[PDB]
């Protein structure tokens, strides 16, 4: 503190007394636990700061190179994504199954959270969060342990909260204990009231490729974004069949066959196959890809949309041909898109609002609703039903793509066979990449000049590339020639040494 004295004197020197004040000064320095870095015996490297352990490296990059080497299907298979990594540190894996949504338990709201206690502190941390569905949720979590337990009945506690009775009572949820020899058991005093089941995965010291780890960004590009991109480009080129094939590397609505065996899954990207529940806590970000990935469900949805966009595009393509036969094709494709969307969901709107004070509204989370505000509908997704409904309506009412009436003949005028031939010939002449040439507003002499300018620009890039190539080769040669001079010199040096020995012999 600063001690401030107010004092004064009289003209004749007499003191006029005093008053003293003290101004406190507080030095506030926030402190916390430092993030800790580790390198384990099994080669895993990780970061730890709470009970959370983040993988820093990968040990199988070589296997991936070896797999890419044998082809696209080897590298993009499910097996690839099951290359395993060592566990990060002392701990164990356990499978938790969260039962189907009910109201007798888990009333009103669908969220739940799983927390871990007594690991680095006696406090809790969220290790999993999500939302209850019509079926169960089967997940496996790594449960870290410290060197010395904070509890002697158990070395870790895991419990669930879900609005209704989120009590965190003693023995609510499994209590885990580490026995000697690495064996993990559940302390029998605990109660699995909020779990369908809990299974300690003894003898599992590993996990599949970590899409949440430090190098996961590369796996997302390798397994998800690349095939989605390739399909995107093929679709722009109107190669609808290849775009379809490429989407199947991410999602096959009809499943997969692997090694003959009929497989039981549709999502071919491991993190999209896994995570069949929405994260109840959104990622607090500004980056939509950080949100997705964190919650893989969002990619599952964008993938779903792209599949529809493709079906719709194929339908639209046919629609525009304006031949009654192609209009029927368009109908077919739209009906498939509808089959895939399924029923338009009923989404009731709420009128409940408490008109809370701003200070109360400022409800935060750190380390009659559980939040205050509610989401909107997501019109972009809802529009897919609206879009198909309208396109189908137009077919049913004999209207064009934009609702205009049309009077097509019952039977189509035969295609001009000369033109069919030139198309067939050009297609089979070579290339085959002879995409729809769109007949636009501009007349021939305009377009001719434009195409011409475009081509002379191309001929310039051509000669430019030619010069680069000739230079690239000229340089390769100058380097070769110098390496060759160097070798001949070394040989001449040996000759001169022998020459000197000869003189010594003389």
């Amino acid at each position: 503190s600063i001690d401030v004295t107010f004092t004064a004197f009289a003209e004749d020197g007499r003191k006029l007394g005093y008053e003293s004040f003290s101004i406190p000064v507080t030095l506030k320095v926030s402190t916390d636990n430092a993030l800790t870095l580790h390198h384990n015996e099994n080669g895993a490297q990780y970061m730890q700061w709470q009970s959370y352990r983040t993988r820093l490296n990968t040990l199988f990059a070589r296997q991936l190179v070896a797999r890419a080497t044998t082809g696209i299907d080897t590298i993009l298979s499910m097996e690839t994504q099951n290359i395993q990594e060592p566990q990060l540190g002392k701990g164990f894996y356990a499978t938790f199954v969260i039962p189907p949504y009910n109201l007798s338990t888990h009333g009103d709201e669908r969220w739940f959270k799983l927390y871990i206690k007594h690991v680095v502190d006696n406090n809790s941390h969220i290790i999993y969060s999500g939302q209850l569905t019509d079926t169960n949720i089967n997940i496996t979590l790594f449960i870290p342990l410290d060197d010395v337990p904070l509890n002697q009945d158990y070395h870790a506690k895991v419990y669930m909260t879900f609005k209704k009775s989120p009590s965190d009572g003693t023995w609510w949820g499994p209590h885990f204990v580490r026995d000697d020899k690495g064996i993990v058991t559940i302390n029998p005093k605990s109660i699995l009231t909020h779990f369908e089941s809990v299974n300690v995965l003894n003898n599992i010291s590993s996990e599949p490729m970590d899409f949440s780890g430090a190098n996961s960004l590369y796996f997302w590009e390798l397994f998800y974004y690349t095939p989605m991109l390739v399909a995107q480009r093929l679709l722009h080129e109107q190669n609808f069949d290849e775009a379809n094939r490429w989407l199947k590397y991410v999602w096959s609505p009809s499943g997969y066959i692997v090694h003959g065996q009929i497989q039981n899954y549709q999502w071919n990207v491991r993190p999209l196959l896994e995570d069949t529940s929405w994260n109840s806590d959104p990622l607090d970000s500004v980056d939509p890809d950080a949100v997705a990935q964190h919650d893989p469900m969002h990619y599952k949805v964008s993938t779903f949309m792209r599949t529809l966009d493709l079906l719709i595009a194929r339908g639209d393509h046919a629609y525009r041909q304006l031949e009654r036969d192609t209009l029927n094709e368009a109908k077919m494709w739209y009906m498939q898109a509808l089959h895939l969307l399924g029923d338009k969901p009923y989404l009731p709107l709420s009128t409940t609002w408490s008109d809370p004070r701003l200070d109360r509204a400022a409800d935060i989370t750190t380390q009659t609703l559980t939040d205050l505000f509610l989401p909107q509908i997501n019109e972009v997704m809802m529009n897919y039903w609206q879009t198909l409904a309208q396109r189908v309506y137009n077919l049913r009412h004999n209207l064009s793509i934009d609702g205009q009436p049309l009077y097509l003949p019952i039977y189509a005028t035969p295609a001009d066979p000369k033109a069919l031939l030139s198309a067939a010939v050009a297609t089979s002449q070579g290339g085959g990449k002879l995409p729809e040439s769109f007949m636009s507003l501009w007349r021939f002499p305009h377009m001719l000049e434009n195409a011409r300018g475009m081509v002379s620009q191309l001929t310039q890039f051509g000669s430019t590339l030619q010069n680069i190539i000739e230079r690239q080769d000229a340089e390769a040669l100058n380097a070769l020639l110098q390496n060759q001079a160097a070798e001949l010199i070394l040989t001449n040096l040996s000759i001169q040494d022998k020459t000197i020995e000869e003189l010594d012999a003389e």
Binding site: L132, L340, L349, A361, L374, M381
Partner: protein, 58 residues
């Protein structure tokens, strides 16, 4: 499963209309967020403490 209502469904329990106060994207939602963050920019004994300047805001 087949259908948007079978996969992806079951996320946000109840929804609200785009113009209500209750919407998470409403100005009130924005106000709530600004407030929780601005509320602690200054010391509680400072003249610029948000509640000192505007005791009614809260």
């Amino acid at each position: 499963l087949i259908g948007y209502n079978n996969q992806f469904s079951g996320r946000a329990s109840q929804y609200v209309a785009p113009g209500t106060v209750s919407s998470m994207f409403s100005p009130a939602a924005y106000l709530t967020e600004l407030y929780r963050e601005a509320r602690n920019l200054h010391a509680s004994d400072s003249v610029y403490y948000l509640d000192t300047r505007r005791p009614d805001l809260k």
